[PDB]
Design a protein around this ligand. Sequence first.
Ligand SMILES: O=P(O)(O)O[C@@H]1[C@H](O)[C@@H](COP(=O)(O)OP(=O)(O)OC[C@H]2O[C@@H](O)[C@H](O)[C@@H]2O)O[C@H]1n1cnc2c1ncn1ccnc21
Ligand SMILES: O=P(O)(O)O[C@@H]1[C@H](O)[C@@H](COP(=O)(O)OP(=O)(O)OC[C@H]2O[C@@H](O)[C@H](O)[C@@H]2O)O[C@H]1n1cnc2c1ncn1ccnc21
Ligand SMILES: *[C@@H]1O[C@H](CO)[C@@H](O[C@@H]2O[C@H](CO)[C@@H](O)[C@H](O)[C@H]2NC(C)=O)[C@H](O)[C@H]1NC(C)=O
Ligand SMILES: *[C@@H]1O[C@H](CO)[C@@H](O[C@@H]2O[C@H](CO)[C@@H](O)[C@H](O)[C@H]2NC(C)=O)[C@H](O)[C@H]1NC(C)=O
Lengths: 250, 250
Amino acid sequence: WRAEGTSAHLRDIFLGRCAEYRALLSPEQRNKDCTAIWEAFKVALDKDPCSVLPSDYDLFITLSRHSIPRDKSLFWENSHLLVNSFADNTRRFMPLSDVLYGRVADFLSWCRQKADSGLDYQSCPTSEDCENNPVDSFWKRASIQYSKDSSGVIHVMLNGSEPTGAYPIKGFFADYEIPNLQKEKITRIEIWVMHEIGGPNVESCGEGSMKVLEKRLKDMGFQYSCINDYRPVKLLQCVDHSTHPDCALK
Amino acid sequence: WRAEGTSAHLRDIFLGRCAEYRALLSPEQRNKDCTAIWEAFKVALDKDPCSVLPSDYDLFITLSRHSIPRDKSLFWENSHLLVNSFADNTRRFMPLSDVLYGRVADFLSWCRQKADSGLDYQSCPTSEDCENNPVDSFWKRASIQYSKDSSGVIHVMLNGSEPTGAYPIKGFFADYEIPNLQKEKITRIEIWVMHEIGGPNVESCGEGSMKVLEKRLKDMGFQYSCINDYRPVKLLQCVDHSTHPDCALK
Ligand SMILES: O=P(O)(O)O[C@@H]1[C@H](O)[C@@H](COP(=O)(O)OP(=O)(O)OC[C@H]2O[C@@H](O)[C@H](O)[C@@H]2O)O[C@H]1n1cnc2c1ncn1ccnc21
Ligand SMILES: O=P(O)(O)O[C@@H]1[C@H](O)[C@@H](COP(=O)(O)OP(=O)(O)OC[C@H]2O[C@@H](O)[C@H](O)[C@@H]2O)O[C@H]1n1cnc2c1ncn1ccnc21
Ligand SMILES: *[C@@H]1O[C@H](CO)[C@@H](O[C@@H]2O[C@H](CO)[C@@H](O)[C@H](O)[C@H]2NC(C)=O)[C@H](O)[C@H]1NC(C)=O
Ligand SMILES: *[C@@H]1O[C@H](CO)[C@@H](O[C@@H]2O[C@H](CO)[C@@H](O)[C@H](O)[C@H]2NC(C)=O)[C@H](O)[C@H]1NC(C)=O
């Protein structure tokens, strides 16, 4: 397996994150059983590391699913850390990592040993090793759910400094979220194409892969919008480049 | 009593955070036993909620203590959330909440029931109910250690929009940290007086309580400097006031 093995102390981390997230939920939907959620989740830890399907996580989703506030969904690509810091633990936006079923697995890795009941802390399969590995099947299932439950203004943060372009035609956003957006309950889609401070401007709104994305969203009937270096996020990037000319204040 | 009852699912949260923090420690001191750390901490939970002393957490500290990088300490008052966001989980600085023993308790509450053996989720004592409550004694002990183990350039974030003054003459910083800073291994102390965006400038460097703090530190023989609205932090505050004139980019 050419990927990170199971995360040490997966269970404690999972339950801890789950318990802390409960506090963020509204009292009405605060009734969540972290233990049951973990049990449902571990069904994948009792299977062949190449025989886990997205549907295997259905129970896990049923037990953890909760509503996402209108206009708070934030999708992204090649911007993990920035998205998490900007979202600020649900305070500004609620990306998948800030939704219960996403929060418990953010950054973690897991898979059962090839031919032994115990978890494999040595390595886990990538899409290359095999399509149906625990981690990818999990995110496919969580992505679909996250997309289906989003409504209002859809925000998307992309990385215009990524060498392969801002929009990966083969990725979770393209293959599992866009096709699952409920057109009827979506007002518009606003894209933020961020560039590293002084970093390379590989692509901006309307260029390369951005034209492909825009065309698709438009052919799908969505009201489309694209902003280069959305200020609030630029200001956050600037925190680490205070003396740079792109970050100077008036 | 008068304070919040112990946090729901305290143990799970505690262990979860402990396990996640282990990953941030260098392989040299990563060998931490969260369960044992939890048991040492629990010693205070099996005592009268008004008879817990800072020394009751000596074992807890012994088992969770670790080094703090030179120049990375960050003290503060009236800016807990700003400090946590800026520190960015160990990336930029290492405040007490980003040190193992502080991390497991950041924002939590705890105390045993008055005459019962179980935890009291209804309420916990405050400084007014009785001085020796579990939470206050915990932070006194934790503050002392954090100070004793700090070195190099000392940073301090104060709130200059605080009505009663940026430097509370009575508080954890004045009463438990400053007295435990070890000059022999300290270069200088740098203060950052932050003001709310547009917010009121109650006090700035060299004003009111700031006069007191400066004189106290100088009388102790420390090199001292103060900065109003330290740029990096100002930029972070700006993320939520992007259109405000104080946050306009050049
Ligand atoms: O370690 P773990 O358990 O694997 O958790 C993963 C993993 O540790 C890390 C991957 O970073 P990467 O730069 O490859 O970033 P990606 O390309 O993988 O993320 C882009 C996708 O996330 C979305 O939110 C966007 O809209 C888009 O669909 O982000 C966590 N992660 C958070 N949300 C997702 C996620 N991994 C797959 N997802 C799929 C969906 N939502 C996710
Ligand atoms: O819920 P919990 O478990 O009680 O966790 C507490 C509590 O939930 C919250 C209190 O916010 P407050 O504005 O009153 O701020 P404070 O006056 O209480 O804290 C300011 C002090 O922290 C330092 O780091 C600064 O340099 C300064 O000495 O911050 C958490 N906290 C984190 N570090 C500390 C802490 N509480 C007391 N401390 C004392 C030391 N380090 C701490
Ligand atoms: C946006 O994409 C750029 C380029 O892929 C990322 O910056 C690179 O990050 C890697 C790993 O940290 C480094 O090895 C490269 O040297 C970086 N290149 C450049 C030009 O900076 C950047 O981290 C991405 N931004 C976000 C928020 O994920
Ligand atoms: C700095 O201190 C100010 C003043 O106490 C804090 O602002 C107050 O915050 C409370 C709670 O959110 C509000 O009800 C008040 O209206 C605020 N007053 C003002 C003048 O803004 C502020 O939160 C503190 N800053 C930080 C980072 O903690």
